[PDB]
Amino acid sequence: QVPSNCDCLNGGTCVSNKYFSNIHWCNCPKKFGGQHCEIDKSKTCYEGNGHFYRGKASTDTMGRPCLPWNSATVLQQTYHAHRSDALQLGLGKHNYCRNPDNRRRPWCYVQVGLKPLVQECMVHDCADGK
Ligand SMILES: *[C@@H]1O[C@@H](C)[C@@H](O)[C@@H](O)[C@@H]1O
């Protein structure tokens, strides 16, 4: 143990609070990591929660390409390319995943056997799949 009101690496930043007796925290870049932030990683596949998102992730949390919002199936669902608020998320002619409702990760109407179920399009990891 090394009570130093902080502990990072790779030249991290040793910070410490004083308005609560002791509320410090390793001050390392968000792209850092490694126990005490000893690596220059770069985790950030969605600065938001999935509201807009502008990457390439088009599959769901399984791998399927998910159904586009123009697939009559999703048209039968709710948030597709023919509801009334799809113009706010631009769902028509496109796929990826949208989260205009109440959810943390971006989901997409992906066919789940016989009913396009919204699945938080797994958007984790983003480095050549490795
Ligand atoms: C910790 O403090 C911050 C403000 C930056 O100077 C970092 O480079 C440093 O490690």
UniProtKB/Swiss-Prot annotation:
Residues 9-32 are annotated as: Binds urokinase plasminogen activator surface receptor. Residues 45-126 form the Kringle domain. Glycans are attached at residue 13. It comes from the Eukaryota. Residues 2-38 form the EGF-like domain. Disulfide bonds join 6-14, 8-26, 28-37, 45-126, 66-108, 97-121. This is Urokinase-type plasminogen activator long chain A. It comes from Homo sapiens. The gene is PLAU. The chain holds residues 26 to 155 of 431 of the full protein.
